[PDB]
Amino acid sequence: VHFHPFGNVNFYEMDWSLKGDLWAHDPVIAKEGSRWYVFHTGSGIQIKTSEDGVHWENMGRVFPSLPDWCKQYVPEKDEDHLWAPDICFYNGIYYLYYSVSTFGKNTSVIGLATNRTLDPRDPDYEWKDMGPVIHSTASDNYNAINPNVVFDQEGQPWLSFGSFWSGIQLIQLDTETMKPAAQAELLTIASRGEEPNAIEAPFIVCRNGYYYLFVSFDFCCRGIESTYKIAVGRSKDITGPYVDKNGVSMMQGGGTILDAGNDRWIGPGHCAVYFSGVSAILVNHAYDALKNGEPTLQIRPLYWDDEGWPYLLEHHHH
Ligand SMILES: OC[C@@H]1O[C@@H](OC[C@@H]2O[C@@H](OC[C@@H]3O[C@@H](OC[C@@H]4O[C@@H](OC[C@@H]5O[C@@H](OC[C@@H]6O[C@@H](O)[C@H](O)[C@H]6O)[C@H](O)[C@H]5O)[C@H](O)[C@H]4O)[C@H](O)[C@H]3O)[C@H](O)[C@H]2O)[C@H](O)[C@H]1O
Ligand SMILES: [Ca+2]
Q1: What is the DSSP secondary-structure string of 37-68?
Q2: Can you give the residue ranges of every domain in the chain?
Q3: Which atom of ligand 1 is nearest to the CA of 42?
Q4: Is 41's C-beta closer than 6 angstroms to any atom of ligand 1?
Q5: Catalytic pick among 13, 15, 21, 26
Q6: Which of 33, 123, 138, 217 has the most CB atoms around it within 10 Å of its CB?
Q7: Where does Ca(2+) bind?
Q8: Is-catalytic flag, 244?
Q9: The domain 1-318 is classified under which CATH number: 3.30.420.200, 2.115.10.20, 3.30.200.20, 1.10.275.10?
Q10: Could you tell me which of 72, 2, 9, 60 has the C-alpha nearest to residue 277?
């Protein structure tokens, strides 16, 4: 399943000196035609576009206003900022997942919107509100935010999500609804194993016979004091057990650190990983120490070593 398509594009041949409107947190990317799209956290889900992948402009948003049903799930929410979108392309349809929540609480719902095209100029454009996907309340020990969809080796879709509480959750989706399958059960597949369980934002990819689970550790959303980092583990089965490069279980704080940030780019996290041919990129945000800690889009080539583990090189100089 080519659920994140990018064409003949070779990410290792592009110079990723990003320009333009770069302010963002919790970014994902998609490409339709020759146009690239970044979906990120903000009013009604915020959208940027680019004709090359490198020069970005703010383009629009997914919802003019919050869908009405959301209030039932999160009655205390009184603004229209939707969090941590995820995008995938399946059966000719775009499935956009997003989070409705309030900060520090686990009364939350993940919604689904669908579209035939990502382009508002295209007369087929219409984000159909397909309603709720999965939710959490105070009686749950997980938080229904931060969705991610992955396809397993048998082409079955799966949803991972989570933030704090018991950690990262996983549940099988139905291929028709792209919502959790009838009697499907929620599994916890990662956790720091203790309090406060600062693990969130899962992103799963399948490469060379392993599922790789990327996550963010520690604390976002504090500008220049954010302590966010990007960590990774892997499993032969999508249901786990996920283990880091040192063999430590990701259900016990395991995870190899991919990026902990530098003197400029503080607290990198909420990442997404995409492939095109034999190339890959990591997408995330980081808090800009030279611009008042403002969350900033980052896109970098991501390499894989001979043992199958991902790694980043030093930042180029521009
Ligand atoms: O930048 C300017 C503005 O941003 C944009 O508008 C919307 C904003 O983006 C949102 O951030 C994205 C989300 O951030 C991550 O998770 C955030 C929170 O972390 C957890 O809460 C943190 C903390 O711990 C809580 O308690 C922990 C649990 O309680 C125990 O019982 C349990 O055992 C513990 O584990 C505390 O209450 C709290 O202090 C929460 O899970 C989550 O709320 C998500 O991953 C991202 O989705 C930001 O918040 C929005 O306002 C605009 O563009 C711009 O104006
Ligand atoms: Ca995500």
Answers
A1: EEEESEET-EEEEESSSSEEEEEEES-SS--T
A2: 1-318
A3: 53
A4: yes
A5: 26
A6: 217
A7: 270
A8: no
A9: 2.115.10.20
A10: 9
d(CA 133, CA 127): 16
End-to-end CA, the chain: 36
Tokens of 189: 């597949």
Per-residue tokens: 239:
């249901």
From the list 301, 311, 224, the residue with the least C-alpha distance to 17 is 301
What technique solved it? Answer: X-ray
Quoted resolution (Å): 1.9
CA separation for the pair 99, 267 (Å, rounded): 21
Q: Both tokens of residue 273?
A: 């990983």
Q: Is 174 an active-site residue?
A: no
Does residue 196 line the site of ligand 1, with CB under 6 A?
yes
For ligand 1, is residue 191 a contact (CB within 6 Å)? Answer: no
Q: Which of 96, 42, 109, 114 is nearest to 69 (CA)?
A: 109
Alpha-carbon distance of 234 to 223, in angstroms, equals 30
Q: Using CA atoms, how far apart are residues 149 and 159, in angstroms rounded to an integer?
A: 5
* Residue/partner pairs of 32-35 with CB below 8 Å, 24 or more apart: 32/117, 32/118, 32/119, 33/119, 35/118, 35/119
